[PDB]
Amino acid sequence: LTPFLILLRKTLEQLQEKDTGNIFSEPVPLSEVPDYLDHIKKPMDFFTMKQNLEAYRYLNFDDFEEDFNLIVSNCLKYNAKDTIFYRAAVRLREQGGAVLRQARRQAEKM
Ligand SMILES: Cc1nc(C)c(C(=O)Nc2nc(CN3C[C@H](C)C[C@H](C)C3)cs2)o1
Structure with missing residues (x-):
């Protein structure tokens, strides 16, 4: 479903938005x-x-x-x-918990 991907996409951006320091937005640098x-x-x-x-x-x-x-x-x-x-x-x-709780509620009504 496009709306599922559309919702997943929006959710991840909401998750990223909580990481104001960008410390989770790319893999931990193994160097x-x-x-x-x-x-x-x-x-x-x-x-x-x-x-x-x-x-x-x-x-x-x-x-x-x-x-x-x-x-x-x-x-x-x-x-x-x-x-x-x-x-x-x-x-x-x-x-993140709260973001995912609301997102899952949206997925429920699909
Ligand atoms: C979630 C997590 N678990 C671990 C172990 C780490 C971790 O060590 N992250 C690290 N990132 C950098 C690079 N980074 C540093 C910033 C200060 C500036 C920015 C531009 C680049 C070095 S170490 O992060």
Whole structure:
């Protein structure tokens, strides 16, 4: 459905809008974080999700939400609590939560 993709697209932009520092909008730079992949099984970020979106890899809402949750859970897992990343993830989880709750309600009436 075009409206499903249209909704998914709008939702991801709302999610990106909460990341005012652009710290989740591209993959973690592995040149700067060489052990990142030692602990994180599946990295995720908003551009990768955008890529999945435009390739029709999100055919249901659950997979979209699951990748969102990875952006947040990865960041909390890897980063120590007293860091800017960890704090930003705690907040994104609450703000992202609400975005995804409203978006899922829209998908329900399709
Ligand atoms: C969600 C998350 N988990 C982790 C481990 C990280 C993480 O270390 N991100 C990093 N990004 C950069 C690059 N970045 C730095 C900014 C200050 C400016 C901007 C233009 C480029 C270096 S380290 O982010």
